Amino acid sequence: EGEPVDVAIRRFKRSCEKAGVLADVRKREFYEKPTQERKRKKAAAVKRYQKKLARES
Amino acid sequence: IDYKDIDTLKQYITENGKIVPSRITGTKARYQRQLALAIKQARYLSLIPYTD
Amino acid sequence: ALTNADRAEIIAKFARAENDTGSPEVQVALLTAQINDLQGHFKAHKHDHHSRRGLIRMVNQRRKLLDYLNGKDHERYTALIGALGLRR
Amino acid sequence: TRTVSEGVAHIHASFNNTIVTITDRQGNALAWATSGGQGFRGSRKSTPFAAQVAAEVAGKAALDYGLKNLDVLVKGPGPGRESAVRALGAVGYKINSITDVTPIPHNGCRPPKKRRV
Amino acid sequence: MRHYEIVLLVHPDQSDQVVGMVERYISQIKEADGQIHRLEDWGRRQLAYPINKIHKAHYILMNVECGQSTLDELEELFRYNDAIIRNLIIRREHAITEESLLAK
RNA sequence: AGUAUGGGAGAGGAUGGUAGAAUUCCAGGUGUAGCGGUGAAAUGCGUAGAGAUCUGGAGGAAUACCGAUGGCGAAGGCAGCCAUCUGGCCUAAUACUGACGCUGAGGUACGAAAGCAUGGGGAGCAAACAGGAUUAGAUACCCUGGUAGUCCAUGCCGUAAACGAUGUCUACUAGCCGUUGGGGCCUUUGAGGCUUUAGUGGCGCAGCUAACGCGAUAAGUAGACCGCCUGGGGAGUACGGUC
Subunit info (chain C)? Predict the structure, then answer.
């Protein structure tokens, strides 16, 4: 009702960031090969596992 | 778990209709697979929306 | 496919002794029945390469059991191949 | 002639350019504006300020129809999307709601190749 | 020789005659051997999205045992009946006789 | 090593049907000057009216979220939902056959993408090709279009950094920490803890190695059978032969 337009825009930006809609279009901008997709996913998984192990230890 | 249980399904469905990852839902793998199959059957039968 | 009843009937027909399930005759009869059953499937599906490998495995296993039985006892082997119509 | 109290404004934001169009409900357009229209021709079209001036022009055009409240729909990733809504608020229209209508395919067509720039 | 769950969505305009088609299908199933383990009417509801520009429809559920020929005939009838928009046939192993949810 | 009966997990394979998102096109309504693209441009496109938005229809291809150092397959590989046909694997104690095993020259089957032959299909992308740009030059990188092909049916071709750059099979040899499918045991108030089995990962003793490094998924300690190497280039080339 009385919420400022700027505050509403900031809330909408945060909601969109949580949704992750923009990342889908960023990915869709260009085609990618399975060869690169596998390497990207493997590297991400390795990095996440290493970080988790470092935190645990 | 079955397709008809919309109340249970909505908990693991997001607001936008995206299925929630097992990372957030803290679920077992077999449960997650059954859950996703149930969600897809439900949105085929038009008990929940694919998007929005 | 093949039910449990038909397999029970072949086991009963070819059982050398009571409860005998692992005899060469029983195994060869079961393999022959399964192979003949799959013949219907492979005409309706010519390019199902992944199941033809299992069919080949069944054929090889039957050949091995038949050769072993021939080595063990010639008369039994003759009787079995005559009963089941196997050329060799 | 016709005056409508309710409005809906679509902000099409793209890397090359940004566009704003104000329509009535049911989708009949009233006024439109572009970065190129208010000068700012060239690579400057992508600058957010061009979006601000375009939004100002669109609001001034819509003032004739006199819709005091408008929904806002933003489509596409581009600079100046925030600037467009800020300009609309400065103009003074009441925003009923703001939503993102950007489409996400379910693995449809093949996109073009990557660029070795 | 198998159990199946049948989900049918039927047009509200033709929902007036549903008692006829359900009985006809029951008779057809009973013709061969027949096993209608469960038959439920969910009630008129609103489709989540418009199906052929129909915003609401009626939901029918049937847990049945029947032969393969009966399965094919039922599928053909469902396909060729216009009032039935959208059907689902799911093979299940063992019987469900307890009253299902959403039928209250 | 194998068989029968009970239970389990899986994008394993073949056929058919069907759902939704998005793109391209076609047709109707609102309405006026740009749209598009790049490092900046320009080609291209727009007042026989575009772009934008809504509405309705046609068609092709591919399955967002789930999705994972996850799963299945001999390998190559496999992902929307439903039905039918169908191969393997894991799991408990009994019952049954009684060495029926391992390997394997020749031989044979399968085998990514591209390419070839007949018929069909053709949305998006795109070798060749046309044009616009940058450049001393542009034959390319960038941009505007675009054909074969990418798709379906029926055959052929037999090649990859077809890689773990590590042939198959069997037994033994400190430990610590994960994960997937099963079995068993103890707590309890229903979820936890322990052990075992078949897979899939991270550290690491001895041992091995020129070093890097491997380390119960060995590249350690031993056995069985096979393929392959003998300085670099000429050269996987010439002649002959098979397809």
Answer: Part of the 30S ribosomal subunit. Forms a bridge to the 50S subunit in the 70S ribosome, contacting the 23S rRNA.
